[PDB]
Design an enzyme around this catalytic site. Structure first.
Site, PDB file in Angstrom:
ATOM      1  N   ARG A   1       1.244   5.016  -0.331  1.00 53.17           N
ATOM      2  CA  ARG A   1       2.096   3.902  -0.728  1.00 53.17           C
ATOM      3  C   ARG A   1       2.029   3.640  -2.255  1.00 53.17           C
ATOM      4  O   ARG A   1       3.016   3.350  -2.940  1.00 53.17           O
ATOM      5  CB  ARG A   1       1.675   2.624   0.022  1.00 53.17           C
TER       6      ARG A   1
ATOM      7  N   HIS B   1       5.069   3.754  -4.878  1.00 55.22           N
ATOM      8  CA  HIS B   1       5.448   2.599  -5.697  1.00 55.22           C
ATOM      9  C   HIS B   1       5.361   2.752  -7.243  1.00 55.22           C
ATOM     10  O   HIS B   1       6.088   2.066  -7.975  1.00 55.22           O
ATOM     11  CB  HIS B   1       4.614   1.424  -5.340  1.00 55.22           C
TER      12      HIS B   1
ATOM     13  N   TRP C   1       3.821   1.549  12.801  1.00 54.96           N
ATOM     14  CA  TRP C   1       5.017   2.284  13.199  1.00 54.96           C
ATOM     15  C   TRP C   1       4.735   3.230  14.362  1.00 54.96           C
ATOM     16  O   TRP C   1       5.600   3.780  15.037  1.00 54.96           O
ATOM     17  CB  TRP C   1       5.561   3.085  11.984  1.00 54.96           C
TER      18      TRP C   1
HETATM   19  C1  HEM Z   1      13.674   1.528   1.710  1.00 57.22           C
HETATM   20  C2  HEM Z   1      12.347   2.084   1.574  1.00 57.22           C
HETATM   21  C3  HEM Z   1      11.130   1.456   1.854  1.00 57.22           C
HETATM   22  C4  HEM Z   1      10.827   0.124   2.159  1.00 57.22           C
HETATM   23  C5  HEM Z   1      11.698  -1.138   2.268  1.00 57.22           C
HETATM   24  C6  HEM Z   1       9.467   0.138   2.478  1.00 57.22           C
HETATM   25  C7  HEM Z   1       8.722  -1.004   2.785  1.00 57.22           C
HETATM   26  C8  HEM Z   1       7.394  -1.085   3.214  1.00 57.22           C
HETATM   27  C9  HEM Z   1       6.759  -2.230   3.620  1.00 57.22           C
HETATM   28  C10 HEM Z   1       7.401  -3.600   3.816  1.00 57.22           C
HETATM   29  C11 HEM Z   1       5.430  -1.857   3.856  1.00 57.22           C
HETATM   30  C12 HEM Z   1       4.252  -2.718   4.303  1.00 57.22           C
HETATM   31  C13 HEM Z   1       3.369  -3.216   3.187  1.00 57.22           C
HETATM   32  C14 HEM Z   1       2.181  -4.050   3.671  1.00 57.22           C
HETATM   33  O1  HEM Z   1       2.355  -5.065   4.351  1.00 57.22           O
HETATM   34  O2  HEM Z   1       1.036  -3.708   3.363  1.00 57.22           O
HETATM   35  C15 HEM Z   1       5.378  -0.491   3.663  1.00 57.22           C
HETATM   36  C16 HEM Z   1       4.232   0.299   3.811  1.00 57.22           C
HETATM   37  C17 HEM Z   1       4.056   1.671   3.607  1.00 57.22           C
HETATM   38  N1  HEM Z   1       5.005   2.439   3.087  1.00 57.22           N
HETATM   39 FE1  HEM Z   1       6.997   1.902   2.878  1.00 57.22          FE
HETATM   40  N2  HEM Z   1       8.983   1.375   2.502  1.00 57.22           N
HETATM   41  C18 HEM Z   1       9.926   2.153   1.970  1.00 57.22           C
HETATM   42  C19 HEM Z   1       9.718   3.486   1.598  1.00 57.22           C
HETATM   43  C20 HEM Z   1       8.548   4.259   1.651  1.00 57.22           C
HETATM   44  C21 HEM Z   1       8.448   5.585   1.212  1.00 57.22           C
HETATM   45  C22 HEM Z   1       9.565   6.435   0.571  1.00 57.22           C
HETATM   46  C23 HEM Z   1       7.089   5.884   1.382  1.00 57.22           C
HETATM   47  C24 HEM Z   1       6.326   7.018   1.053  1.00 57.22           C
HETATM   48  C25 HEM Z   1       6.773   8.306   0.627  1.00 57.22           C
HETATM   49  C26 HEM Z   1       6.515   4.771   1.994  1.00 57.22           C
HETATM   50  C27 HEM Z   1       5.178   4.705   2.411  1.00 57.22           C
HETATM   51  C28 HEM Z   1       4.488   3.656   2.961  1.00 57.22           C
HETATM   52  C29 HEM Z   1       3.213   3.721   3.482  1.00 57.22           C
HETATM   53  C30 HEM Z   1       2.380   4.969   3.673  1.00 57.22           C
HETATM   54  C31 HEM Z   1       2.937   2.425   3.915  1.00 57.22           C
HETATM   55  C32 HEM Z   1       1.686   1.955   4.638  1.00 57.22           C
HETATM   56  C33 HEM Z   1       0.596   1.500   3.678  1.00 57.22           C
HETATM   57  C34 HEM Z   1      -0.545   0.762   4.342  1.00 57.22           C
HETATM   58  O3  HEM Z   1      -0.892   1.043   5.488  1.00 57.22           O
HETATM   59  O4  HEM Z   1      -1.100  -0.108   3.701  1.00 57.22           O
HETATM   60  N3  HEM Z   1       7.383   3.782   2.134  1.00 57.22           N
HETATM   61  N4  HEM Z   1       6.581  -0.029   3.314  1.00 57.22           N
END
Ligand code: HEM
EC number: 1.11.1.5
Length: 291
Positions: free
Chosen positions: A45, A49, A188
């Site tokens: 993540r 970012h 997920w």
């Molecule tokens: C429209 C695109 C995206 C949106 C709106 C989005 C949004 C989010 C949100 C809301 C979270 C949760 C954050 C939290 O509460 O800790 C999250 C987590 C995460 N995202 Fe996304 N995401 C997007 C794209 C991506 C992409 C492109 C990647 C990686 C190549 C990604 C990887 C991750 C990972 C691995 C987590 C989990 C992190 C954890 O467990 O703390 N995301 N995302």
């Protein structure tokens, strides 16, 4: 802006492989974080970012300048919870003080994916730290409460097409949302620290129900204890995204190859590589090295 990749002086493959080994060994060791999910998800993540602030119109943002290290980007609302991935990598930066920030942040993402059984991501070195006044303003990272046309248009600023967006989105098999960070709660899928095509299979096989969560945000919840964001659920609402989702559900190797290509492009956006530059590095895993 032009951003020319500059190798850290005197460093070669063997040097960067030691920084990889250090990150991989500390992933092994701090396995208890976030109820035993471990730091691998927050590290990919973080690499997405630091990279997702890029704008193809004026070459601002992106992974090059390592600007997350500055207050403005560090305290961006969209980055809530990433401070944990920063704190993890910080002893590693004290151990290898010569690596630039953008190279360490991006390498944390590559190491996390390959150690969580993912594809090999080719990585290039050369990002140079830039001053606090080049720090992108907050607000360039995507909202979750939105549809497939928001997603296509947003990813166009990073010039990602349809296949790249669907492949990239498959990293949501990893980790989970946390109510205190983003206003959403839940994982997920079941295997959230092993890299697989599970996100696609859940999206096509679960009986998803739209509900409001404790933060008053909507999300899609399934009987199995899993959730999908509105932006995630978009990929089966759009006819073009949905044929790619199906394709990755039936073929994890095709997903691994496409994710590999798009995650590297995402990490390299905004960076010019001279052809005297070293080829991309393929790093060995602890397992390959017997460590
Ligand atoms: C429209 C695109 C995206 C949106 C709106 C989005 C949004 C989010 C949100 C809301 C979270 C949760 C954050 C939290 O509460 O800790 C999250 C987590 C995460 N995202 Fe996304 N995401 C997007 C794209 C991506 C992409 C492109 C990647 C990686 C190549 C990604 C990887 C991750 C990972 C691995 C987590 C989990 C992190 C954890 O467990 O703390 N995301 N995302």
């Amino acid at each position: 802006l032009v951003h020319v990749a500059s190798v850290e002086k005197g460093r070669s493959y063997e040097d960067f492989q030691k920084v990889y080994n250090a990150i991989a060994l500390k992933l092994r060791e701090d396995d208890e974080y976030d109820n035993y999910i471990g730091y691998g998800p927050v590290l990919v993540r973080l690499a997405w970012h630091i990279s997702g602030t890029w704008d193809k119109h004026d070459n601002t943002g992106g992974s090059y300048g390592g600007t997350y290290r500055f207050k403005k980007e560090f305290n961006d609302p969209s980055n809530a919870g990433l401070q944990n991935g920063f704190k993890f990598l910080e002893p590693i930066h004290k151990e290898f003080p010569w690596i630039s920030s953008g190279d360490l942040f991006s390498l944390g993402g590559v190491t996390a994916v390959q150690e969580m059984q993912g594809p090999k991501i080719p990585w290039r070195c050369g990002r140079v730290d830039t001053p606090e006044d080049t720090t992108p303003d907050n607000g360039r990272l995507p909202d979750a409460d939105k549809d497939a046309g928001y997603v296509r248009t947003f990813f166009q600023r990073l010039n990602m097409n349809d296949r790249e967006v669907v492949a990239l989105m498959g990293a949501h098999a990893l980790g989970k949302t946390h109510l205190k960070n983003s206003g959403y709660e839940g994982p997920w899928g079941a295997a959230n620290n092993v890299f697989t095509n599970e996100y696609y299979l859940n999206l096509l096989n679960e009986d998803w129900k739209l509900e409001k969560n404790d933060a008053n945000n909507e999300q899609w919840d399934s009987k199995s204890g899993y959730m999908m964001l509105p932006t995630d659920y978009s990929l089966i609402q759009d006819p073009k995204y949905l044929s790619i989702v199906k394709e990755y559900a039936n073929d994890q190797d095709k997903f691994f190859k496409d994710f590999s290509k798009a995650f590297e492009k995402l990490l390299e956006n905004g960076i010019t590589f001279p052809k005297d530059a070293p080829s991309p590095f393929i790093f060995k895993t602890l397992e390959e090295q017997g460590l």
